[PDB]
């Protein structure tokens, strides 16, 4: 209970629109502590579609309860006719827009370290018996280039076909195994530098082509071993899909020799930050706990 703070409307203000999605509008905001004169920047998500507040609050307590360096915690809530969710502000934005804007300068060690971190987050959520149901590059937030976090779980509970497991499309079944499917699509988005999955295919026909065996194609930089994993994520038989613990191991092993599983021109020019740059980044933007990025042997 002590992890969710109930904000009052006068305590905070919206100052800029950061974008919008299926479930609401995200704003940059400013949190005015009562009696103080400081302006603390936040991210506010205002839901869409104004006794349901008990429901909403009880899921908000679960969202506020997640303590993992690769999943964003819900910090606070304001309950007016539109529910408002307050979270930490990530000025780098989402990983989808990050990889699109850096399509010509992202090195192999970044890409592989991101999928390790996304797996760690999803593994934590699976250990909590929590199903995300909307994993995608757009829903991974860049806190620093070296540290990314999953966002927006639980929002679906209270339609992204091209990221959905087949059984989710046909039968609205969501498990940790269908999250693994969306993880595969997420990895594919990153390895393609933000391509749209199944570009040119109507979403209404995705379940037809999936049943016939068709899958997203092999990104030009992915070796065979990396494409295998992604394909193992899209198995029809969910119980045959890898588990999140397995993906951590697999992507950490590849991150220890990144230039053997990703082939990208200029890959030499693009290693992880110096110890110096990492200390500087962390002191200004990221002082929370974290397991170190896996470096090449």
Q: Which residues are tagged catalytic?
A: 134
Q: Does 82 bind ligand ANP (CB under 6 A)?
A: no
Q: Can you tell me which residue has the tokens 């109507």?
A: 202
From a second copy, ligand ANP, Mg ion, none, which one binds at residue 218 (CB under 5 to 8 Å depending on kind)? none
Nearer to ligand ANP, 163 or 261 (CB): 163
Question: If we measure between CA atoms, which residue out of 116, 107, 142 comes closest to residue 292?
Answer: 116
From a second copy, ligand ANP, Mg ion, none, which one binds at residue 39 (CB under 5 to 8 Å depending on kind)? a second copy
Answer for which of 225, 257, 268, 277 binds a second copy (CB under 8 A) is: 277
The answer to whether the CB of 60 falls within 8 A of the CB of 53 is no
**Which uninterrupted H or E stretch holds 32?**
none
Burial class for 144, CB neighbours closer than 10 Å (0-12, 13-18, 19+): middle
Q: Does 286 bind a second copy (CB under 8 A)?
A: yes
Nearer to a second copy, 50 or 283 (CB): 283
Query: Judging by DSSP bridges, how do beta strands 40-47 and 140-144 pair with one another?
Result: unpaired
Answer for which of 6, 8, 16, 20 binds ligand ANP (CB under 6 A) is: 20
Written as six digits, the tokens of 266 are: 């200029």
Answer for which of 2, 50, 51, 81 binds a second copy (CB under 8 A) is: 2
Burial class for 103, CB neighbours closer than 10 Å (0-12, 13-18, 19+): exposed
Q: Does 141 bind a second copy (CB under 8 A)?
A: no
Stretch that binds Mg ion, among 49-57, 148-156, 185-193, 271-279 (CB under 5 A): 148-156
**Which uninterrupted H or E stretch holds 12?**
strand 12-20
Q: Which of residues 138-197 bind ligand ANP (CB under 6 A)?
A: 138-139, 141, 151-152, 160
**Which uninterrupted H or E stretch holds 77?**
strand 76-79
Q: Does 285 bind a second copy (CB under 8 A)?
A: yes
β-sheet bridge partners, residue 25: 20, 46
How far is 33 from 193, CA to CA, in rounded Å? 40
Burial class for 122, CB neighbours closer than 10 Å (0-12, 13-18, 19+): buried
Stretch that binds a second copy, among 2-10, 171-179, 213-221, 240-248 (CB under 8 A): 2-10
How far is 149 from 67, CA to CA, in rounded Å? 12
What SS3 state is found at 98? Answer: helix
From Mg ion, a second copy, ligand ANP, none, which one binds at residue 20 (CB under 5 to 8 Å depending on kind)? ligand ANP
Query: Judging by DSSP bridges, how do beta strands 76-79 and 140-144 pair with one another?
Result: unpaired
Q: Does 39 bind a second copy (CB under 8 A)?
A: yes
Nearer to ligand ANP, 24 or 258 (CB): 24
Using CB under 8 A as the binding criterion, the count of chain residues that bind a second copy stands at 37
> Interface residues with a second copy (CB under 8 A)?
1-5, 31, 33, 35-40, 42, 73, 75-76, 88, 91-92, 101-102, 105, 145, 274-277, 279-281, 283-288
Chain contacts with ligand ANP (rule: CB under 6 A): 18-24, 26, 43, 87, 89-90, 93-94, 134, 136, 138-139, 141, 151-152, 160
């Amino acid at each position: 209970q002590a992890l969710l703070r109930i904000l009052k409307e006068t305590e905070f203000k919206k100052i800029k629109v950061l974008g919008s999605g299926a479930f609401g509008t995200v704003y940059k905001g400013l949190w005015i502590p009562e009696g103080e004169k400081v302006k603390i920047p936040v991210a506010i998500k205002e839901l869409r579609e104004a006794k349901a507040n008990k429901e909403i609050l009880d899921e908000a307590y679960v969202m506020a309860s997640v303590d993992n360096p690769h999943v964003c915690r819900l910090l606070g809530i304001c309950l007016t006719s539109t529910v408002q969710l307050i979270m930490q502000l990530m000025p780098f934005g989402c990983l989808l827009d990050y990889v699109r804007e850096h399509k010509d300068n992202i090195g192999s060690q970044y890409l592989l370290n991101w999928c390790v971190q996304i797996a760690k987050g999803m593994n934590y959520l699976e250990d909590r018996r929590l199903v995300h149901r909307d994993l995608a590059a757009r829903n991974v937030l860049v806190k620093t280039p070296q540290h990314v976090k999953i966002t927006d779980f639980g929002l679906a509970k209270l339609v992204p076909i091209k990221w959905m497991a087949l059984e989710s499309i046909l039968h609205r079944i969501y498990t940790h195994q269908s999250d693994v499917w969306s993880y595969g699509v997420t990895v594919w988005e990153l390895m393609t530098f933000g391509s749209k999955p199944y570009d040119g295919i109507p979403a209404s026909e995705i379940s037809s082509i999936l049943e016939k065996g068709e899958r997203l194609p092999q990104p030009p930089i992915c070796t065979i071993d990396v494409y295998m994993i992604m394909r193992k994520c899209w198995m029809i038989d969910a119980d045959s899909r890898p588990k999140f613990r397995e993906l951590i191991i697999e992507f950490s092993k590849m991150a220890r020799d990144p230039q053997r599983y990703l082939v990208i021109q200029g890959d030499e020019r693009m290693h992880l930050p110096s110890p110096t740059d990492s200390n500087f980044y962390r002191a200004l933007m990221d002082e929370e706990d974290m397991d170190d990025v896996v470096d090449a042997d």
